[PDB]
A paper describes a structure:
Toll-like receptor 4 (TLR4), a superfamily of LRR proteins, is the principal receptor mediating innate immune responses against infections by Gram-negative bacteria. In this process, myeloid differentiation protein 2 (MD2) recognizes various lipopolysaccharides (LPSs) released from the Gram-negative bacteria, forming a complex with LPS at its hydrophobic pocket. In an attempt to prevent the systemic immune response caused by LPS, a TLR4 decoy receptor was constructed by combining LRR modules from the TLR4 ectodomain and VLR. The constructed decoy receptor was shown to attenuate the TLR4-mediated signaling process by trapping MD2, implicating a potential therapeutics for bacteria-induced sepsis and inflammation.
Analysis of the interaction interface inferred that four residues (Thr-110, Val-132, Val-134, and Asn-156) on the decoy receptor were in position to make additional hydrophobic interactions with Leu-108 of MD2 when substituted for larger amino acid residues. In the case of Val-132 and Val-134, replacing these residues with phenylalanine or leucine might create a strong hydrophobic interaction. To analyze the interaction interfaces of other single mutants (M41E and V134L), we obtained the modeled interaction interfaces by superimposing their apo structures into the complex structure of the wild-type decoy receptor/MD2. For this, we determined the crystal structures of the single mutants in free form at a −2.4 Å resolution. This result also validates our strategy for the design of variants with high binding affinities for MD2. Superposition of the mutants on the wild-type revealed that their original backbone structures were retained, which represents the structural characteristics of repeat proteins.
Numbering used by the authors: 27 to 303
The structure:
Amino acid sequence: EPCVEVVPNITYQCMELNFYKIPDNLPFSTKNLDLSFNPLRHLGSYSFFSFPELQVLDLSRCEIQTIEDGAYQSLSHLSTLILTGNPIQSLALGAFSGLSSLQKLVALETNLASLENFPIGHLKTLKELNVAHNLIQSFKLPEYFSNLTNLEHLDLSSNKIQSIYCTDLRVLHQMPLLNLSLDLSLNPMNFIQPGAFKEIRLKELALDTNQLKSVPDGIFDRLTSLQKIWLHTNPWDCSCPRIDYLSRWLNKNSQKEQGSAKCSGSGKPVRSIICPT
Ligand SMILES: *[C@@H]1O[C@H](CO)[C@@H](O[C@@H]2O[C@H](CO)[C@@H](O[C@@H]3O[C@H](CO)[C@@H](O)[C@H](O)[C@@H]3O)[C@H](O)[C@H]2NC(C)=O)[C@H](O)[C@H]1NC(C)=O
Ligand SMILES: *[C@@H]1O[C@H](CO)[C@@H](O)[C@H](O)[C@H]1NC(C)=O
């Protein structure tokens, strides 16, 4: 059965077997399938009909370029789907149809340019969405996010986001509350419109290694749910009183800040700056 049997009728390692399609010489009760590094090129409808028992499918670096409507139509118990490294250049509006139990979607490096046309509007069970390392330019969350009521982890790091406007998180208002861990680090971000995190419950915020020089006063006021924040490796402008707010704040919430936001030029910790009144 060319793939390796990690666990009888359960787990198999088919990576780098030079497959052009999904194998059929595997038990139907399979739960974990790793097909990474196989030139699959395309995924038509019912490409996993002979695996209605899957829960974890790894399709990393499979050279997949398109996924037709109902490609995973069968897979009703798939929990984790890894598509990392695939040069996707076409995604059917029903490409993810059939995944009624998907909790973790990993789409690192899949030429994603807009969450707008990202067909995940029907995945209510989605807990983690990792779309880091992509071409996303805007942080404006599509209104279909109001349907992803279980989403507790969102990674948009290493994309092309330049700023965070008040409208971006609009949708997160007209929907249920939840512990959302947001990662927006490693972005060419240099602006954050005032009051963009109000009424928004955030557990963790990652804004490190961007292009931020300053942040609106009171940007992190009512975030009692906040536990971890990253702001280090940013060209912070510590002139006064422009840096007054962030100074005191980061100084009070010291145990929350991971790493240390430093002043450009001096390299002085922003937390240890005191602006005269
Ligand atoms: C992985 O799946 C295979 C099925 O292809 C398992 O082997 C099969 O085991 C069943 C028993 O569950 C055997 O079927 C029948 O079992 C009854 C038990 O009462 C017995 O009375 C019958 O005579 C008959 O054996 C079947 O023969 C057998 N087939 C194979 C593969 O030889 C295998 O055990 C599974 N491995 C794991 C993960 O346990
Ligand atoms: C969930 O959101 C999608 C996207 O707008 C919508 O089509 C659907 O009716 C909503 N409810 C369901 C059926 O999940």
